[PDB]
Write a protein that binds this ligand. Structure first.
Ligand SMILES: O=C(c1ccccc1NCCN1CCOCC1)c1c(-c2ccc(O)cc2)sc2cc(O)ccc12
Ligand SMILES: O=C(c1ccccc1NCCN1CCOCC1)c1c(-c2ccc(O)cc2)sc2cc(O)ccc12
Lengths: 154, 154
């Protein structure tokens, strides 16, 4: 069983590496790193609910949208964490690039990110992006509310 | 070398488990799980900058404040991830409890969390909490801005 777990982890790590370094037009084929029923998306949003992209087909459509609205995006400072589960990885990184959201001024978006990658039979079954939405608000020119700190220790 | 790394990982995991299940008055001694120069705090805030608590002494003072403003806090649904670094762990969990911030109505705070734990010589050198601040806004009655989705694929 260890042989099977070790083999899975080494292969899966390569897929995480490839995913995190896919840029430009290659993003339009990255849905092929997912299972047919794979899920990706953003788990930290203004609503408090994830926005999940369900299925390899919808993931490929989302990649077209993402390439338009984040046309020059790069992940940076990438740290890949294997876990005791050979099919579960975490990634800490930063990311930056233009943000071109419908109805908002063109902006520059920078943030810190955590990504979760869960695998099934050599491909990504679930990818989840976690960030601070306040920084995406800022990139869009949306006012960020401020918790009053006057009564808090400083 | 492997024997030392295995031993470190097994000990550090016990510390993560202890940290995540420390409640009530025991929180006032949890700073003793840190190195003398250990750091803890919140990496996801409305300002976009972490709010770090630096040093075991200041972590103990922060615990007094936290016990007042989060008096019944519980971490739930705890998943501890070991990594290839025996001194680096990640935790995915939820959390819930009253929030009693100065000058805000008493509220009920629920959120999803990721925690990073980095260890040095058997104690926590760096703890970092990551969450979606929009849910803390909601718990405090602060209006959360809404990204307009009309132009986005749905
Ligand atoms: O940004 C997204 C998003 C949603 C799902 C999956 C990925 C997303 N972005 C992932 C961005 N990262 C980082 C940059 O480079 C690419 C990867 C949001 C919305 C959205 C909804 C439907 C869509 O068809 C497209 C976008 S609504 C909304 C509201 C918020 O408060 C915050 C974010 C969003
Ligand atoms: O909440 C905190 C906080 C700050 C530092 C360390 C831990 C914190 N909370 C940790 C909460 N978790 C979950 C609940 O149970 C305990 C653990 C925030 C502020 C703060 C500043 C100075 C202080 O002396 C005390 C609090 S300002 C502000 C603004 C925001 O937009 C969001 C959060 C905060």
């Amino acid at each position: 069983e260890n042989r099977a777990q070790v083999a899975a982890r080494q292969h899966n790590r390569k897929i995480v590496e490839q995913y995190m370094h896919t840029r430009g037009e290659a993003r339009l084929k990255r849905h092929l790193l997912f299972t047919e029923d794979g899920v990706g998306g953003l788990w930290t949003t203004d609503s408090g609910q994830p926005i999940a992209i369900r299925g390899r087909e919808k993931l490929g459509e989302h990649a077209v949208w993402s390439l338009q609205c984040f046309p020059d995006w790069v992940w940076t400072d990438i740290q890949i964490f294997e876990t005791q589960d050979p099919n579960w990885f975490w990634v800490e990184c930063r990311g930056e690039g233009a943000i071109v959201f419908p109805g908002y001024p063109r902006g520059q978006y920078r943030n810190h990110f955590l990504h979760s990658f869960r695998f099934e039979n050599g491909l990504i079954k679930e990818q989840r992006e976690f960030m601070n939405p306040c920084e995406q608000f800022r990139s869009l020119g949306i006012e960020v509310p401020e918790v009053r700190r006057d009564g808090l220790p400083s």
